[PDB]
Design a protein around this ligand. Structure first.
Ligand SMILES: COc1cccc(C(=O)N[C@H]2C[C@@](N)(C(=O)O)[C@@H]3[C@@H](C(=O)O)[C@@H]32)c1
Ligand SMILES: COc1cccc(C(=O)N[C@H]2C[C@@](N)(C(=O)O)[C@@H]3[C@@H](C(=O)O)[C@@H]32)c1
Ligand SMILES: *[C@@H]1O[C@H](CO)[C@@H](O)[C@H](O)[C@H]1NC(C)=O
Ligand SMILES: *[C@@H]1O[C@H](CO)[C@@H](O)[C@H](O)[C@H]1NC(C)=O
Lengths: 741, 741
């Protein structure tokens, strides 16, 4: 089981064919028929090793680490001849052969070993890939979980030298663009969490992690899809090139990965392969001893007594297979050895064409410094040469990171893969053909964004998580993380940034006071109207002649003003109104004192009536000073969180100070009118004035101490002030008209 | 630089000597002079390979991975002779030589390679240690962070195949005994966090992680102590056997690790070593070419023109060195090869003694199945044979986990290590000789335990962290995580589990009422006393004869009872007292109705006085029914969070219902006594009774509507009820005595 065609030079090469059940049919013998294709297409091509036939010596690796070492001794046991192997297509296969070809100085060219450990050039100093490392693959998994703003993800990586050193470079590149990984764990096949149902349940315990980064190998992604359909669930499988663009890892679970996003490595494929690999039947196939049963296992044929025996019209056309992505890399990484062993011949022995004596030892260290910086044109089957087709190794012997972004679009019945994107500067994937799980762009964040009514961003200690919590309704949410207050008087709008002020109320609308006391004040116009018969119609009455005929024009005209000052208590507050209420209340109780205590010396006496007529302005001039000097415009009281009630610019004691200027003259009114409690003059002094000395001004000391207790203060001061003069309007001044007529 | 002494058989062995600056002097040539000691002590010992001389072929490893492979080819390049190597003392040295000795079937016996990857017997099937794995070392780091209850730790492990597979078995054994690791990171020498100041600052950003699990190698623990003293800080270094019991990793930082707890592997050392290694001078030392400059580098001597040249009286006694712990393991793991190559000779060729023809090929696979189950007595220098000294491999080729627990006690000036503990069942370390950092048993938990006044355990989503938060003061903290309420009436004690009830108040102490109204009631005894002159002294008065002489014994005796029912309003509430208040208040106002409305028909009238004398019990019999049928015991009102005020078992309307039974007879009292407002009989009816018809019962309708408004209800009903009868006690019944005398 090893090909041996002779040649003046020998190229090695060890390929994963077995897996020893299957022949692997996609990344296996579809690559061994490509490297052997290029060797068949070198010896015919002149000006590239002319006259020096290249022969190969190929062995399988059985897709296993410690079996590759037993097959790697077939090269070097003649050295204790080979001028370079073509590496191993897997990762753990090609690490622990570079730890044995290093000792004999044999160069190794891998073509798929995307691992980060193989750039430490102090240990593997004979290892140049033609595939970019996995640091440029975590960089395409941070810029693809930020173009969709997924933040709360859950990474899964297989154990070994591929996952654990390709996910330790993702956790140090997802904690740099604020991506919060929930659950990271191993899945590998040596007793960590080897039950695949024990790890698909852990990804189901989190309900808010629908984006799972599958950085696993090609073995633990056909046993994590065959264990994510039994224990039935679904996510958005974002996966590395372990999954890749393989249509044989998904052969029996075509509905659970129906929105998967995988990224292969970008390759414009070769177009002379499908005229060669398609024309290889088991009848005409000599060299490789694994191709004689490849068509047996692929087409399920036979050659013991199994199913349908091979008919000769069974070939491999484009209805069977699609050419693998990493077939450009196989024919590229074998010409790089063919450009090294040609430029060496142009240096050591340029006069001769065949193998000289100076190139018969094959100095390995000199072969690694004539080759590591060797750029070239291309694999010559791919056109657009200058448009990114230059094979070129870096200082570490790598390629350039060029990553297509595939998608598992299940649209045409046949569940096929489909390209959407790019890399190397550009995240250029177009969201118009990407199908998804449940046909929607999914979200995975730690906490949901909530309503902007009272919530706020409260991130306790980290960046990826927060919590929305209600705050006060009088505040505004300005900085979107802590709401702030605007103060009393103003109320925030629906935007929760600015606050709008409020007026007081419609005091004059009804309030059970815009119709009640003004109807009592509607009869207040009838107090002076009913007393107008004493005024002008019957001014020559003998009882009025013995009364204060000049005094009743002060005693009853202001009684109508006491029935008129309540009108200003219902209008809008203003310096023309609420300061006039300070001028009105002093004028209203300028009659209850000047017609009770003064009329004891006038109506129950004109030699001193000039001082009594000047007694109304005895404090009213000083009351004019307190109605002019302090602030007499407006105010606005603010109670608990909803009050804009606009009282005038005084206090309760300021009205009490004006109340003290007149009621003290009414306090000693009945004390100065207690002597005439039995003896009248015209049956009116002891019969009427003593009643208004007691009963009238007691109401002036009843509701007035209650004026500083109430809150709305609607009719406690408007009605009762106008109602208190109706006693002294009728029982002493309208009472005289009762026996008149 | 390789020892070669001949023999009929050959034992290998590769030791870490260089590091190529130092000769490492503790784990290096103090081991190579021990394996070569046992080979010098085998050929003299009969009955253990008799007549077959054992020769060694020893090479250095330079303490490096990929340099051991260039020296491992010196054994096997004659096979493309050696009958077994004695392994590599390091971890990464002895993994990637078992991946090359496996191919030629050569057994390898390590003696310090404590790693968990080397028990996967599908790959390294020619590798039997004599040191227990690292799964039994994480099991001694979970049971040592639970005996001190440290929970919030921060693990640090070096990169490679020792740390990352010895700390991935600690994180899966610290999340099993509730130990919450804060910061886990790599420190290894390939561009992860290779600045050691960048990782000692990350352990300083957490202020609550003073316990750091140092699972690093012997290289990143002399550059993490030489970078934890420059950027000066201190912790409690709990460290694996990378640190171990080495007194050369701490040579210049003897104060920063002064409370360190390290665990080596338990070994009762050999006692024939210090008679052999102490007697090896550079004059008499032939074989090993590294010992000729070992004493040059150890004693800082010379042999270009450096310091003090070697005098011949310079030897190595017990004042220089202490024998390493893993020297029992070197002489043990080389006799296991000597018991394998002896029991094979007793099987294949027992008739002859020397090497026969059947043992001249040295079948390697048969050498690994005659040996892997081979128990033996001991290395024969260690006594107490049956007391745990049996060399024995398990099914995976291991030892038994026996771990001493050292301590860096800096007590004697010379900062020496000191043993405290044990393992293999028992955490038996005794906390009486353990010095610490700052002489205290440290703590590292996520959140501190708080005061039990109002706090509670609030663990949001995890187990390792919580938060203490204050709750209500009327609740008790029962379950130590959520405080619970006990309800009104009872108040929790200092234990915050049980609640104690409260009485109401001392109502009769002062309350501005235990001296005020009772002094007014002290004169209440003087109302009947001043009226006693009308009672017995002057009962034959003509004004009293025209008055109700039989009626005043009902009108004034109950007036003293109205001055006596206020006494029950100050005593303790009870069915004898507060239900008597219901019987008293009806009896108190059985006089204000029967001497105002009834005395209008008696004192201002005996043909109908028998119905008036029966009018006191006209509703009092039904008032006795409501004083007997409902609940008449007690009650207890509970206001907001502090109130146990015990009113009697009625409502305010229940007293109002008793008030409605008598005051309605007093409501129509003045209406029935409004006719005699001008005409008296003995100048007492229209002059006194009409005053008590108006002024007395108006006070009965003044304070009684205020009795259901007050909260404390101290003197609003006790004083004013007794004060209201003083009007009808004096102005109508004491007023008649005023013109009498
Ligand atoms: C089955 O045993 C193992 C062990 C380790 C890895 C893998 C594995 O899945 N390798 C995958 C991913 C790959 N990009 C890489 O080199 O890791 C290349 C691509 C290829 O060559 O076709 C494979 C499999
Ligand atoms: C300097 O380069 C390296 C690389 C890897 C590990 C180490 C290392 O520190 N090994 C330490 C710890 C050990 N118990 C083990 O076997 O890992 C044995 C004990 C000994 O044999 O004396 C050493 C050093
Ligand atoms: C997150 O990314 C999505 C992807 O288009 C975008 O629509 C959205 O606006 C982004 N959110 C923020 C806050 O930038
Ligand atoms: C935690 O361990 C220490 C170590 O002795 C012990 O004293 C303490 O009581 C333990 N705490 C609990 C809650 O068991």
């Amino acid at each position: 089981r090893e090909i041996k065609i002779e040649g003046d030079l020998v190229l090695g090469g060890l390929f994963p064919i077995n897996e020893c059940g299957r022949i692997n049919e996609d990344r296996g013998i579809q690559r061994l028929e490509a490297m052997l294709f290029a060797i068949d297409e070198i010896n015919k091509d002149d000006y590239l090793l002319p006259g020096v036939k290249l022969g190969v010596h190929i062995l399988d690796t059985c897709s296993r680490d410690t079996y590759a070492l037993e097959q790697s001794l077939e090269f070097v046991r003649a050295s204790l001849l080979i001028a370079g192997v073509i590496g191993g297509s897997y990762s753990s296969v090609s690490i622990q052969v570079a730890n044995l070809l290093r000792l004999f100085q044999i160069p190794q060219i891998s073509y798929a070993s995307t691992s980060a450990k193989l750039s430490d050039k102090s240990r593997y100093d004979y290892f140049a890939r033609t595939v970019p490392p996995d640091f440029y693959q975590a960089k395409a998994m941070a810029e693809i979980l930020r173009f969709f703003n997924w933040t709360y993800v859950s990474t899964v990586a297989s154990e070994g030298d591929y996952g654990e050193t390709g996910i330790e470079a993702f956790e140090q590149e997802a904690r740099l663009r604020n991506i919060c990984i929930a659950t990271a764990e191993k899945v590998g096949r040596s007793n960590i969490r080897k039950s695949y149902d024990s790890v698909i349940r852990e990804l189901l315990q989190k309900p808010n992690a629908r984006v799972v980064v599958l950085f696993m190998r090609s073995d633990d992604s056909r046993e994590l899809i065959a264990a994510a359909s039994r224990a039935n669930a679904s996510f958005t499988w974002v996966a590395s090139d372990g999954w890749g663009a393989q249509e044989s890892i998904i052969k029996g679970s075509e509905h659970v990965a129906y929105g998967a996003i995988t990224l292969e490595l970008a390759s414009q494929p070769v177009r002379q392969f499908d005229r060669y690999f398609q024309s290889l039947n088991p009848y005409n196939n000599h060299r490789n001893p694994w191709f004689r049963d490849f068509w047996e296992q692929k087409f399920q044929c036979s050659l013991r007594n199994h199913r349908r025996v091979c008919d000769k019209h069974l070939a491999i056309d484009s209805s069977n297979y699609e050419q693998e992505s990493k077939i450009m890399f196989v024919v590229n990484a074998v010409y790089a050895m063919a450009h090294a062993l040609h430029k060496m011949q142009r240096t050591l022995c340029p006069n001769t064409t065949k193998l000289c004596d100076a190139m018969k030892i094959l100095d390995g260290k000199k072969l690694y410094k004539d080759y590591l910086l060797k750029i070239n044109f291309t694999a010559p089957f791919n056109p657009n040469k200058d448009a990114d087709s230059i094979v070129k190794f870096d200082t570490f012997g790598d390629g350039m990171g060029r990553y297509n972004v595939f998608n598992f679009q299940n649209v045409g019945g046949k569940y096929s893969y489909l390209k959407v994107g790019h890399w190397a500067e550009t995240l250029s994937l177009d969201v118009n053909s990407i199908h998804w799980s449940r046909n929607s762009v999914p979200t995975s964040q730690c906490s949901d964004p909530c309503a902007p009514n009272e919530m706020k961003n409260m991130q306790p200690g980290d960046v990826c998580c927060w919590i929305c919590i209600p705050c006060e309704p009088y505040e505004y949410l300005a900085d979107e993380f802590t709401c702030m207050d605007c103060g009393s008087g103003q109320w925030p709008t629906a935007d929760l940034t600015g606050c709008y002020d409020l007026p007081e109320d419609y005091i004059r609308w009804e309030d059970a006071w815009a119709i009640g006391p003004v109807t009592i004040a509607c009869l207040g116009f009838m107090c002076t109207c009913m007393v107008v018969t004493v005024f002008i119609k019957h001014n020559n009455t003998p009882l009025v002649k013995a009364s204060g005929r000049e005094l009743c024009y002060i005693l009853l005209f202001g009684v109508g003003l006491s029935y008129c000052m309540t009108f200003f208590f219902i209008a809008k507050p203003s310096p023309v109104i609420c300061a006039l209420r300070r001028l009105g209340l002093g004028s209203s109780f300028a009659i209850c004192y000047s017609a009770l205590l003064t009329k004891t010396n006038c109506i129950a006496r004109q030699v001193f009536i000039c001082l009594g007529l000047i007694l109304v302005q005895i404090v009213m001039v000083s009351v004019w000073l307190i109605l002019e000097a302090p602030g007499t415009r407006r105010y606005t009281l603010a109670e608990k969180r909803e009050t804009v009630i606009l009282k005038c610019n005084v206090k309760d004691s300021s009205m009490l100070i004006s109340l003290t200027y007149d009621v003290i003259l009414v306090i000693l009114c009945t004390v100065y009118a207690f002597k005439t409690r039995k003896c009248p003059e015209n049956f009116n002094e002891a019969k009427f004035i003593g009643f208004t000395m007691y009963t009238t001004c007691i109401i002036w000391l009843a509701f007035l101490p209650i004026f500083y207790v109430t809150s709305s203060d609607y009719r406690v001061q408007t009605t009762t002030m106008c109602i208190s003069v109706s006693l002294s309007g009728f029982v002493v001044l309208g009472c005289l008209f009762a026996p008149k007529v």
